[PDB]
Design a binder for this molecule. Structure first.
Ligand SMILES: O=C(O)c1cnccn1
Ligand SMILES: O=C(O)c1cnccn1
Length: 161
């Protein structure tokens, strides 16, 4: 079963709560399907489109719209990924929280930051011979930033209210 395997891979590479970019692919009476990271599709249920009540999804999104959504549930049995636009926006903060955009593994159970393998907290510099790890990290971070920036844009485009 390839689909299960893909969705499982997805679940194991994304934390619940993660906020991710998506493209709206399809509208239905009960919500809007969104393709996540040019990957696979989740559902934004109609009640999770916005804070206000909504009679049809078109009231909030349209096919082809880009958006940042929160992953709120992953059901590998029913092979549904649940998404929320509403909650993504509820959790937005002008201040950047990398945990919510792809770097949750840089935080422990308390929420304390974990200095990555190869970075010297004392020296505050990357250790020579770790260029691979520096690269991967810098990349992950950049993406997390991009994502937050986009979300900011989405919130700014809330000049609707
Ligand atoms: O048609 C479906 O699969 C469906 C309908 N309502 C809620 C969730 N899923
Ligand atoms: O049956 C589903 O859950 C479905 C439908 N359209 C797109 C993605 N998923």
């Amino acid at each position: 079963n390839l689909y299960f395997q893909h969705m499982r891979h997805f679940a194991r590479t994304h934390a619940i709560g993660q906020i991710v970019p998506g493209k709206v692919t399809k509208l239905v009476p009960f919500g809007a399907f969104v393709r996540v990271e040019e990957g696979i599709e989740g559902l934004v249920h109609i009640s999770e489109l916005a804070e206000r009540h909504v009679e049809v999804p078109d009231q909030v999104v349209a096919v082809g719209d880009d958006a940042m959504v929160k992953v709120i549930d992953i059901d590998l049995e029913r092979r549904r990924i649940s998404l929320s636009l509403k909650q993504a926006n509820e959790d937005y903060t002008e201040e950047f929280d990398p945990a919510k955009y792809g770097m949750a593994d840089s935080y422990d159970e308390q929420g304390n930051y974990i200095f990555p393998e190869g970075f010297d907290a004392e020296t505050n510099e990357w250790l020579e011979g770790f260029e691979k790890q520096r690269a991967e990290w810098e990349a992950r971070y950049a993406e997390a930033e991009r994502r937050h920036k986009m979300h900011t844009a989405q919130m700014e485009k809330f000049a609707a209210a």
